């Protein structure tokens, strides 16, 4: 009963704005983030940290703008309000989004914003910069015109803050996930013979927007039939036929925090091969989840999924039929962030880490099945953000 | 009569799929871009170039994927097919979009892709790498772990290719602009008392899709009244008689961007609105009249500012006036070199494409932004779209 048979206007009747709205991040929590960054800076022997516009700037300062060709950055040192380097003409706009007190250092269009970063270093006798790994390489070129000391990669400091989510972060993420899960549910409901992949993408966007996501669908992949064999798809619109699997991978943000959920379900009657692979995928996902608790190396969670596949005669390693990519990724303010659930990653799981659990099986020439739900690590184990699917024709628990 | 009076029904009658479709970029032109990069690399003493996923990888290879945490890159050396560094699991999906013959070098999830880059360098005896300045700093870290030699910034090489558009690229951008102009005109026509900023966003997207844009609207800003003085925090507004409307939108066609702003009055304008609107047009016109081969980009920005100063606004970036640059290059990116900004000595040359948008802000009152792009010709410039005629005639 979850697949097909829902009219567009029936689905529409389940799309009122979401009424269980998590609290934004508070001022105190931004100070705690700065404080934690300072601990990790000192641990690494760094005395200044430069964070570019994008997910990390939003994390530390609230500023949500996307990166551009104009340097917008926070420069954190071991004391005092961090410096916010920003185009002069954007000052009014910056003041309206900041969640953290800052010392603003503004540059007019022809002025060199990298000189301002280094001047603010020199003012506090800081000579050991770490730079945001997400920032454009052009920024290392700019800083090099003025800085002669070693520039360290800030990834350890940034991850060491962001990997473990606070309760407020978890609730924002949960909201986003509950919204997208509903959207997934309605998309499965309106599916019918002949529906276009593009029509389902457009519905999903409309539906996330109606529920009050920040900005509709963050992304959306919809594939039918043989196209499901490509983990990230191929160009081209498809039209649905009985007997095909349907893989829908989509998500939204709520105050920048992501959902990221995949469902793969049959439309019509499945073959034995489809059933067999779908069950195996549910089982691989379930084994990865059972492996999660504090102290467990991230690679062990990936190993747990591959062990199920290999005991069914798939794999080993990335061999196809099997799992050609890692089991999962971290999620937060970015879709993909630390920690990664991947072979070779010894990083121990800690309470509050969030990650995907999406051990997709690909059968070359045929189809793929990806079941994707995220979890967070609790004090004694893990918790699903969204409950896994139940069957090939029952995508929703 | 450009503004208002049109039904949604009438607008839809002008929304058949675009029939004058510009040719996609062909296999030979990708090879010419690779060749062009190679001479630039030789001119600058560089023997290896790494391009990351994004507009530059698309330019060189046709791969359109946005950058992610996994290295997807093209490594170009002084000879042989370029090397495409890619996750192994994405190989099938990479093959469906590649437009250039490459030597694929695939890595499994636990393997170090930066190692592959350096091994490909070492096989060619390349030791003088330039790195895409748009790529994440993480890639510098990854490469530096394997290299003792300098990692140069590739921006001279990449801009030396991308800034001057081929005829094929100009035609694709022309298509994108012609479609977006129509959308702008329809949006003006359907505007009425009460209409939502959100309803206009939605219609704009629908229209861009109906005409055959790559993916609807690329972006859409719609501002009414006092909000036009705040060019950068969204919020839904409803239209009233006496308000300015500013609509900034664009699409892509084979990834080539349009980016057009129109600002017009709904109802009767005040004398201040009229005077600033006229000034905006004049500033835009003076910038365009400055464009010709060998003019410095900053001379084009100064030409706009001179208009505003002669009329008593400014000076410099002071308001009421022009608080930021006059315009930006445009291509596969909305914003790319060359920038029409004070301090930029870069001389314009034939084929360069940029925006001309010397917005006037009157603080706390309103703003008027007129935005049309141009390309540089052998003797002067050519508008992709013709400028507005009047505060109540947004379309020439
Ligand atoms: Mn995922
Ligand atoms: Mn996903
Ligand atoms: Mn624009
Ligand atoms: Mn523009």
TrEMBL record, chain B:
Q: Does the keyword Zinc apply?
A: yes
Chain positions recorded as Zn(2+) 2 binding sites: 90, 232
**Chain sites annotated for binding Zn(2+) 1:** 69, 335
Q: Name one GO molecular function term.
A: metal ion binding
Tell me which residues bind Zn(2+) 3. Answer: 248, 259, 357, 371
Which Pfam families does the UniProt entry name for this protein? Creatinase_N, Peptidase_M24
**Highest taxon of the source?**
Bacteria
Among InterPro entries, the record links this protein to: Creatin/AminoP/Spt16_N, Creatinase/aminopeptidase-like, Creatinase_N, Pept_M24, Peptidase_M24B
Residues noted as binding Mn(2+) 2 in the record, renumbered to the chain: 259, 328, 357, 371
Give residues annotated as binding Mn(2+) 1. Answer: 248, 259, 371
Domain Creatinase N-terminal, by residue range, is: 33-164
Q: Please report the stretch or stretches of sequence annotated as the Peptidase M24 domain.
A: 172-378
Q: Name the positions where Zn(2+) 4 binds.
A: 259, 328, 357, 371
- The leader peptide range reads none
Q: What is this protein called?
A: Proline dipeptidase
């Amino acid at each position: 009963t979850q697949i097909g048979g829902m009219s567009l206007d029936q689905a529409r009747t389940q799309l009122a704005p979401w009424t269980q709205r998590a609290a934004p991040i508070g001022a105190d929590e931004y100070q705690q983030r700065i404080e934690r960054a300072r601990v990790l800076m000192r641990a690494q022997g760094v005395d200044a940290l430069l964070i570019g516009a994008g997910t990390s700037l939003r994390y530390f300062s609230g500023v949500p703008w996307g990166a551009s060709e104009r340097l917008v950055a926070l420069l954190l040192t071991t004391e005092g309000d961090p410096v916010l380097i920003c185009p002069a003409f954007e000052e009014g706009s910056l003041d309206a989004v900041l969640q953290l007190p800052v010392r603003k250092r503004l540059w007019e269009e022809h002025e060199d914003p990298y000189a301002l970063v280094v001047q603010a270093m020199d003012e506090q006798h800081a000579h050991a910069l770490a730079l945001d790994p997400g920032i454009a390489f052009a920024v290392h070129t700019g800083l090099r015109a003025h800085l002669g000391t070693a520039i360290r990669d800030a990834g350890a400091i940034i991850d060491g803050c962001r990997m473990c989510k606070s309760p407020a972060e978890l609730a924002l993420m949960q909201q986003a996930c509950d919204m997208t899960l509903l959207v997934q549910r309605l998309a499965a409901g309106i599916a019918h013979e002949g529906i276009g992949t593009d029509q389902l993408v457009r519905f999903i966007d409309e539906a996330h927007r109606a529920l009050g996501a920040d900005n509709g669908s963050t992304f959306c992949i919809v594939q039918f039939g043989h196209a499901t064999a490509f983990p990230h798809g191929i160009p081209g619109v498809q039209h649905l036929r009985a007997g095909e699997l349907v893989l829908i991978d989509t998500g939204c943000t709520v105050q920048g925090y992501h959902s990221d959920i995949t469902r793969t379900w049959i439309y019509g009657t499945p073959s034995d091969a489809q059933q067999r692979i779908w069950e195996l995928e549910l089982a691989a996902q379930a084994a990865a989840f059972a492996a999660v608790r504090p102290g467990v190396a991230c690679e062990a969670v990936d190993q747990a999924a591959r062990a199920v596949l290999q005991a069914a005669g798939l794999g080993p390693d990335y061999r196809l039929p099997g799992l050609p990519h890692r089991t999962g990724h971290g999620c937060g303010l970015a879709i993909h962030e630390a920690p990664y659930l991947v072979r070779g990653n010894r990083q121990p799981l800690q309470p509050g880490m969030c990650a995907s659990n999406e051990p997709m099986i690909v059968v070359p020439g045929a189809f793929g099945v990806r079941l994707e739900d995220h979890f967070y690590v609790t004090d004694t184990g893990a918790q699903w953000f969204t409950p896994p699917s139940v069957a090939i024709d029952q995508p929703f628990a």
